[PDB]
Ligand binder design. Structure first.
Ligand SMILES: *CCC(=O)Nc1cccc(-c2csc(C(=N)N)c2)c1
Ligand SMILES: *CCC(=O)Nc1cccc(-c2csc(C(=N)N)c2)c1
Lengths: 230, 10, 230, 10
């Protein structure tokens, strides 16, 4: 499948090389190849997958925003719309690819809380990116799909993970962004961010120096958003 | 405008 | 040819949009499409072509350098070499594409000094990028091709353009980089940069405020290199 | 290390 003939370990090694070279499209293709080998992913490998696709879709989102703004200013020839649609279609294909990997078959094989929450958070994230550009008869259903994925991830993380766990924190961070930016629920976003921050603060005393650094980094993003939102 | 999570967590 | 069905003007408009969105691969594809319409390019269009491909090959060169360094450290499995070769092959294809557009048929139709020197400078630049990764029985011939293109461009620019002309200045800048980095001729590089800088300095008095800004910007790059080289 | 020309000139 382009990558079907390459060893899993070689795909992982090349994903790490691509990251060092800031070649994120390559990195994503290598990690897609590794997933399609059908074995579960380690914690490091899950992070490589996420880094690769987050950087790819990140460029597409940034481009889409530039073009949508130009298109909106033009509405105060068809080229701006056509080109925004091209980028949008490419973004939707990347999101569909990631959602396909999660559905076939990362999530169903993920039994541990750290893997299952990571993947369900990813599912919410890539439906959220779809929701950012959605405008037709599917925007509501896309939003509901993001919410459902995030909610299942939240339920597991609250049962199975400490409040300072960085996956749990990044999940709550992104679900709060979903509430604020997608779901027109800024009060829910603010409440979630506050409660997440305060419950992690009260658990920091249990952590090593390095774990403390990991958790407080994500907590600072919650604080930055609260400052932006209030 | 709102900040979201880094890709890498743990 | 992907772009054969799109209007020339629409390709140019979309190249400008892609630039605003920092979508340089798209920008390059649009400008390649515009060139293949077979009409000569305006000054603005030549610059769009150059910006697009310079940014594309710029990312490839940066990646190739990262990977080559890793490969060299490994030589103090085949994956690092394989992946460096992949990037290298992709870079060589981009260079070959640009050289093909110049040869079919931008250069032969370019009669004015500003267009002919711009294109011949480009030809030297993309042979120089090929030379940066060349190592076999072709490195010498690639270097000679760069030198020949640069030399023809220099001869025209000295006859037809003032010493402060930004195309003439950027040409001399890049030919000096060729001498220093590719041709193992640092003295030639330093002499060329010094003479170029001093002859432009003596012509600045003829310029408008805006032209003065254009010329002194490139002159500062000559000075920065001289400071690095001496 | 050496600086080369910007893409856009004029
Ligand atoms: C969950 C356990 C874990 O994070 N394991 C691990 C080990 C080594 C490296 C990573 C890691 C996180 S992000 C990253 C990268 N951008 N290369 C690597 C994770
Ligand atoms: C040689 C004459 C010339 O430069 N004409 C011109 C007019 C308008 C805009 C440009 C130009 C130079 S770089 C650039 C871009 N990166 N879009 C546009 C040139």
């Amino acid at each position: 499948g382009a990558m079907g003939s390459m060893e899993r370990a070689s795909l992982i090694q090349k994903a790490k090389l691509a990251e060092q070279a800031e070649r994120y499209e390559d990195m994503a293709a290598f990690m897609k190849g590794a997933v399609e080998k059908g074995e579960e992913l380690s914690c490091e490998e899950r992070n490589l997958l996420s880094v690769a696709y987050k950087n790819v879709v990140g460029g597409q989102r940034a481009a889409w925003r530039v073009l949508s703004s130009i298109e909106q200013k033009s509405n105060e020839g068809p080229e701006v719309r056509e080109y925004r649609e091209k980028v949008e279609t490419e973004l939707q294909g990347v999101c569909d690819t990631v959602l396909g990997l999660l559905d076939s078959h990362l999530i169903k094989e993920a039994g541990d809380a750290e893997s299952r929450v990571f993947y369900l958070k990813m599912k919410g994230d890539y439906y959220r990116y779809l929701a950012e550009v959605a405008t037709g008869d599917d925007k509501k259903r896309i939003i509901d799909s993001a919410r459902s994925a995030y909610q299942e991830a939240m339920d597991i993380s609250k049962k199975e993970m400490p409040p300072t766990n960085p996956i749990r924190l990044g999940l709550a961070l992104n679900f709060s962004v979903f509430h604020y930016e997608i779901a027109n629920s800024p009060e829910e976003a603010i409440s979630l961010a506050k409660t997440t921050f305060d419950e992690a603060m009260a658990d920091l005393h249990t952590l090593s120096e390095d774990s403390y650094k990991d958790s407080t980094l994500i907590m600072q993003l919650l604080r930055d958003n609260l400052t932006l939102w209030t | 405008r709102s900040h979201s999570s880094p890709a890498s967590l743990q």
